[PDB]
Amino acid sequence: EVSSILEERIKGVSDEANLNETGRVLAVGDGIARVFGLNNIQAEELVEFSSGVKGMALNLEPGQVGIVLFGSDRLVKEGELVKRTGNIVDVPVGPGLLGRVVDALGNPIDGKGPIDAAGRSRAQVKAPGILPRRSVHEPVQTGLKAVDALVPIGRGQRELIIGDRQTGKTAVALDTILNQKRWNNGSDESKKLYCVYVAVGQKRSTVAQLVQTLEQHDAMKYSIIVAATASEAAPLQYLAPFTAASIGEWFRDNGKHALIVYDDLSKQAVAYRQLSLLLRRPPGREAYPGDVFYLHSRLLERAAKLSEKEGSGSLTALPVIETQGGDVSAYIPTNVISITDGQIFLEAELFYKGIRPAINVGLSVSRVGSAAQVKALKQVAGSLKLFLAQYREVAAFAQFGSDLDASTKQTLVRGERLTQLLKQNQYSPLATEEQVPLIYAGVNGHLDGIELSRIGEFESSFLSYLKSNHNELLTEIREKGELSKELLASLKSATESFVAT
Amino acid sequence: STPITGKVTAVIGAIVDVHFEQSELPAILNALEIKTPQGKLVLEVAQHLGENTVRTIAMDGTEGLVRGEKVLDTGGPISVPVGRETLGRIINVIGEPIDERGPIKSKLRKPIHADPPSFAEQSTSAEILETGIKVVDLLAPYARGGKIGLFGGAGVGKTVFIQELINNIAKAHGGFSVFTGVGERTREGNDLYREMKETGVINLEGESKVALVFGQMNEPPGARARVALTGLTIAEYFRDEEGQDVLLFIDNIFRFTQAGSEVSALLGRIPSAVGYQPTLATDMGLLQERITTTKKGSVTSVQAVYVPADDLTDPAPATTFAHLDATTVLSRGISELGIYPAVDPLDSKSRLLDAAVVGQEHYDVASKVQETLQTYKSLQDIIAILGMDELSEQDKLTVERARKIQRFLSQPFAVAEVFTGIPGKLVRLKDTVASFKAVLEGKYDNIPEHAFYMVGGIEDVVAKAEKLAA
Amino acid sequence: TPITGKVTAVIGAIVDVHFEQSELPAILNALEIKTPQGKLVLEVAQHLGENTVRTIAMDGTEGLVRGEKVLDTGGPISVPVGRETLGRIINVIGEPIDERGPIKSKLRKPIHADPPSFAEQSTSAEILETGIKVVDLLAPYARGGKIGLFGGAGVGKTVFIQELINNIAKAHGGFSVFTGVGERTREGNDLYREMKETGVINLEGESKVALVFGQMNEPPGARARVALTGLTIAEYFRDEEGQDVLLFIDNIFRFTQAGSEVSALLGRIPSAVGYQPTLATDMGLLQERITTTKKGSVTSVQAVYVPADDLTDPAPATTFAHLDATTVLSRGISELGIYPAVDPLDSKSRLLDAAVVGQEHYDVASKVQETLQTYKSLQDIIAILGMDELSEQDKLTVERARKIQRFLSQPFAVAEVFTGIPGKLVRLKDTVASFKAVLEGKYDNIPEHAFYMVGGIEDVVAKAEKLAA
Amino acid sequence: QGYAAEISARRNAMDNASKNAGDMINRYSILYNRTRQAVITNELVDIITGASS
């Protein structure tokens, strides 16, 4: 059994042939070696140090070729030989990575036995052209009401989660993964999203809890978790988004639709900063090398909604950027904002204010996509935005001892209720069919009268009521995805019925 | 071919240094081609460092290169294809058909570099360009053959504003146009390709009245720099050699600035203020000067600019602010006011607005508007604390008018039937002057403020007043 | 044969040796240069090639003659561990600095060790009660956790920790490690005495605490590897003894700070605000070798001396990444006179949840946050105009929050000496009740002065009677 | 009597307002001045770092 498997492993070692290229380490330390030799050498190649370390090569110099270690310094020693792997960096890519936590190299760090890989791919692959694309015609709804209504998310599209660190920053994303359980449970491959959660720079404990959370909500069975924990090398961290990307491309190539969360992309930047500063490249703005913009841009543009001819396979991206000090004027947040197709600013003050989600809707946009949300939900939330914008304006006016007139207080009263309506507890995704009613009620001002405290009660109860009687109605919302006259009337009558009792 | 062979010496990102052999040294600004399984990697010669070694910038990804790789020299700055056989296809940085239109070129190629026309060449202009966009027409009228400048920040629907200009002005104009995208998304690209195929400007049957040169952000910083030069030369061919009126559109020139800043560091040039290249002024200058209406054809350039984090004190927008003839600022606040156009009227200055150029009447109407809006803004603080109290009745009527005017400037865009749903209005310039004049006289102070909001001309404003009245 | 060398350079405390024989050095080896001041321990940190190492030197480098004989002791510095670490305060090398003579050891262990694997991780959340009202209420700690404090410049950073040591670690039976990196020596002696007095160190008996203490005087390099030494002691308890440990670290800012000193000399182009470009990796290694694994649950407490009182500085920033709870304490709240000085809108824990401390606790916390957030919001209006000019409904909220602010100050037992006010340890069960009552406005009817610097809700009532007199 | 008290009270209040606002000016002014110097310092560090390279 275990003996036979071990026998297989030893048996799987056998013989070798003359190793081309050698070179001798000289100066070395920090994690950046420089070796003399290696006259033939591809750029970005993986070179096997005789210590055991494998290292990509980022500098080819007419002196000493600079091989960035992916292993510990202590293993490496002076004048060691390094023999070139002969492979530009590459990742195993396959179906088996579904249900696996894997490190950057791609080895399972959850050790659920070695990955079943249908191919290998290369870590740097250029973005799909103008020619292989279709415009985004397939929604992907996160199940957070504020997100779906206010900042609609569509497959393909890169949508930036930005805001102050670990203020459940991870949790906003995890909610999306959880609602993608609903499609996952379902059927039709192109109506399913596979999900790759990439964790760079986070402590082992956070990650371990995260994988545990995913197993707890039993949403682990369609996820790939790519990890590069905090201890792990700055080179491995730099390489980590790009090797996640290739795994995603395997889905994209298959025509499968999937979504890749790059949390935190900010930690990639720190990694590249370190990498550059020990390759002694001239340091850019704030000591992040200038081609950090290039790095992030090439990475992000690999996710796309392909053309019908090219199988439509939509890798969707969600970068997550920690905003240190909450000031996005910093070079890395500014750079990312340009790259991304939407911004989803989250604000700390609103978290404290008890708006959870704490997403600041004034700063949150989805600059493209509107066929990225359900037609029904678009109709209802047509003036949800307007009302909220008005609420914001009116509330601003109210400050500094202005005695509001009743007309402004109609807006104010309506507005307050909407705010209570939005709130959702962490790890509690909702079904869109039952988010359409809640917004109908709010927008049609049926909640305006209802006392502020018991709005949450109303929400819970209303849903129960809709489950009780109008479960036919909910089925229709699922089936037709645009509210018909009959549905609008049914919904109006139902909502009216529940205003009192 | 000449045996100008160099062996690569250092691959250190985009910077790739080559070691040509003795007596065969290329000349600065030459173009090197290296046979690769990636086609031919083009390296643009940018310095001599002596000892038969040049330091050149790559136009393509430098991964998987071999230290010592033989490099042929095709000499001189990259020679693109030019013609009217460049009309209607997507042309990449080095010129290749990235839409599989097969061979591109008429009979000619031209270098990416060209010199900016001399003072003698310059020929004064002072035309007019009606855009139908009311704010533009009244408060900052453009002029044909101009150097229009779309300053605005991140995501001001920057593309959307330009899209409206293309929808109206390009189809209307007989001149060829070139839409050049420097570092813009392939998401935006696929939409633009599709959209301009739809508007038929790109007619996939007959000749297109526009060409496309899409350079995207996924292309290396080096390639990003020379997307601009390539497009510029296509425009120059139209301007000069075909003699035609052009109506150039380029996107986004912060990407050009930014690209130059990045490779500046890599070139070893010690960073200047806010990390920008020390050659910032002159690099911008070469691009800007090259684009001009001379004795030859009139280039009606519309140049996009991205203002990082809406900070105009930053040197990169501020330097560009001088170089463009007809500045327009599209501000976040105005977007937030829900006004699309997002044009910030008091912060949009044009040299083309004058009591002679567009005459005294146009000027006077706009002057009254400017004062009125400025009054409303100045009074906003008073309203904030003091409120309507020790503030004049006359002032209050002016405030009310300003709110009406603010939303009279709101009129939809046709290309925001998908980003709104109300169809845009190409309101005649003369009609706009008249209609705004009426407002100032207070002839429509019986019309709701919201009945000025997001609708066209006076006729429409009255109609929406009636609509709201019901 | 002896890997002899000569000291090619002595550029600060970054001595460089040039090994003669072509027997290789190895990165993170330790070298002993014998000096007439006793040996000097250096640690190989770079190989510059051609048998010239560049070595961090733990202790002072004065006196060294350029061309000084070396011997390579091989491998990283080896501490001595055992039960005998308990009740001993040890130098970086491991020599007793409390001069309690030879520490009998079983295993001597390398200072450097690899972070335990992702597979070995185990996560739990057993609510630890600190008996500090603000801590329990806002962000309760939990066993095995990594607890965080972001105290300002001498805000009694140590004092906060001392109260915690006094409460939690005398309520913990398992092993506990105290590691004080670059702390003021006199305070350390006070701590040593206090521990001996409170029997936690019982020198006659056994001690359930062990200590590593690094004076703020000590040369930067020593301070850099003080952490790694302590971290080994913790691992021995975690692993070899198996027993659940505890760990206190103060300040881990010194770990970063020291790193910033050496890096420049080491030969590194420094990152912004001068910080080491190896900040992320170094912090990473330290904080992933502190973790609750199947081997043992090590509750760890980390203290950050916020530099210049800017928390956006890169060193505090990377700390925020590796913690399960934080309780930022800021100078402003200290100036207001509130001891403890924990910011109430800048505390967080993953251990605050409705499924952890229950729906009622979570609900109570929601209201506390909301009231305080409002109170902070109206600070502008309060200053510009009068407090009477505040809206009446809001004025109630403000009055409640003013009370809440005062209520949160609880006398501490180690502070009891300094303040003079007798300490108050209020039960967690009591705390939920106490705040709940205040939220129901029950005892909102008596002065702010009554709420100021007192314990439980009942104590406020009694103090109202006292105040009334 | 009431109206006179209203106008009298506002005069008192607005005077006290002016004092409180003045204090806030002084506090943000010091912050401004320090911050201005700090920006110069932060820029300088980038320049030095560049020069060193």
Swiss-Prot record, chain A:
NCBIfam families, per database record: atpA (TIGR00962), PRK13343.1 (NF009884)
Keywords associated with the record: ATP synthesis, ATP-binding, CF(1), Hydrogen ion transport, Ion transport, Membrane, Mitochondrion, Mitochondrion inner membrane, Nucleotide-binding, Phosphoprotein, Transit peptide, Transport
Pfam families reported for this sequence: ATP-synt_ab (PF00006), ATP-synt_ab_C (PF00306), ATP-synt_ab_N (PF02874)
An annotated Gene Ontology molecular function: ATP binding
InterPro entries assigned: ATP_synth_asu-like_sf (IPR023366), ATP_synth_asu_C (IPR000793), ATP_synth_asu_C_sf (IPR038376), ATP_synth_F1_a_nt-bd_dom (IPR033732), ATP_synth_F1_asu (IPR005294), ATPase_a/bsu_AS (IPR020003), ATPase_F1/V1/A1_a/bsu_N (IPR004100), ATPase_F1/V1/A1_a/bsu_N_sf (IPR036121)
Keyword Membrane in annotation: yes
PANTHER family: ATP SYNTHASE SUBUNIT ALPHA, MITOCHONDRIAL
Top-rank lineage group of the source organism: Eukaryota
Organism: Saccharomyces cerevisiae (strain ATCC 204508 / S288c) (Baker's yeast)
Protein name: ATP synthase subunit alpha, mitochondrial
Family: Belongs to the ATPase alpha/beta chains family.
GO (cellular component) term, any one: cytosol
Note: Present with 41500 molecules/cell in log phase SD medium.
Modified residues (Phosphoserine): 14, 135
UniProtKB/Swiss-Prot annotation, chain B:
Predominant location category: mitochondrion
SUPFAM superfamilies per UniProt: C-terminal domain of alpha and beta subunits of F1 ATP synthase (SSF47917), N-terminal domain of alpha and beta subunits of F1 ATP synthase (SSF50615), P-loop containing nucleoside triphosphate hydrolases (SSF52540)
Enzyme class at the top of the EC tree: translocase
EC number: 7.1.2.2
Binding of ATP, residues: 152-159
Gene3D superfamilies given in the database record: 2.40.10.170, Bovine Mitochondrial F1-atpase, Atp Synthase Beta Chain, Chain D, domain 3 (1.10.1140.10), P-loop containing nucleotide triphosphate hydrolases (3.40.50.300)
GO cellular component: cytosol; mitochondrial inner membrane; mitochondrial intermembrane space; mitochondrion; proton-transporting ATP synthase complex
Signal sequence, start to end: none
MF GO annotations: ATP binding; ATP hydrolysis activity; proton-transporting ATP synthase activity, rotational mechanism; proton-transporting ATPase activity, rotational mechanism
Cellular compartment(s): Mitochondrion; Mitochondrion inner membrane
Gene Ontology terms: biological process: proton motive force-driven ATP synthesis; proton motive force-driven mitochondrial ATP synthesis
Modified residues (Phosphothreonine): 74, 199
A Pfam family annotated for this UniProt entry: ATP-synt_ab_N
Keyword tags: ATP synthesis, ATP-binding, CF(1), Hydrogen ion transport, Ion transport, Membrane, Mitochondrion, Mitochondrion inner membrane, Nucleotide-binding, Phosphoprotein, Transit peptide, Translocase, Transport
Modified residues (Phosphoserine): 335
InterPro entries for this protein: AAA+_ATPase (IPR003593), ATP-synt_VA_C (IPR055190), ATP_synth_F1_bsu (IPR005722), ATPase_a/bsu_AS (IPR020003), ATPase_alpha/beta_chains (IPR050053), ATPase_F1/V1/A1_a/bsu_N (IPR004100), ATPase_F1/V1/A1_a/bsu_N_sf (IPR036121), ATPase_F1/V1/A1_a/bsu_nucl-bd (IPR000194)
Chemical reaction(s) catalysed: ATP + H2O + 4 H(+)(in) = ADP + phosphate + 5 H(+)(out)
Record family assignment: Belongs to the ATPase alpha/beta chains family.
Extra remark: Present with 164000 molecules/cell in log phase SD medium.
Protein name as catalogued: ATP synthase subunit beta, mitochondrial
Organism: Saccharomyces cerevisiae (strain ATCC 204508 / S288c) (Baker's yeast)
Gene field: ATP2
Curated annotation (Swiss-Prot), chain D:
Outcome reported for the amino acid change (mutating residue 47 to T): In ATP3-1; dominant suppressor of the slow-growth phenotype of yme1 strains lacking mitochondrial DNA
Cell location: Mitochondrion; Mitochondrion inner membrane
Signal sequence, start to end: none
Tree of life domain: Eukaryota
Self-association and partners: F-type ATPases have 2 components, CF(1) - the catalytic core - and CF(0) - the membrane proton channel. CF(1) has five subunits: alpha(3), beta(3), gamma(1), delta(1), epsilon(1). CF(0) has three main subunits: a, b and c.
Family: Belongs to the ATPase gamma chain family.
Function: Mitochondrial membrane ATP synthase (F(1)F(0) ATP synthase or Complex V) produces ATP from ADP in the presence of a proton gradient across the membrane which is generated by electron transport complexes of the respiratory chain. F-type ATPases consist of two structural domains, F(1) - containing the extramembraneous catalytic core, and F(0) - containing the membrane proton channel, linked together by a central stalk and a peripheral stalk. During catalysis, ATP synthesis in the catalytic domain of F(1) is coupled via a rotary mechanism of the central stalk subunits to proton translocation.
Note: Present with 28100 molecules/cell in log phase SD medium. PubMed:12898710 reports two tandemly repeated copies of ATP3 (ATP3a and ATP3b) on the right arm of chromosome II in several laboratory strains, including S288c. This has not been confirmed by the yeast genome sequencing project.
Protein name as it appears in the record: ATP synthase subunit gamma, mitochondrial
Organism encoding this protein: Saccharomyces cerevisiae (strain ATCC 204508 / S288c) (Baker's yeast)
Span covered, complete protein: 257 to 309 of 311
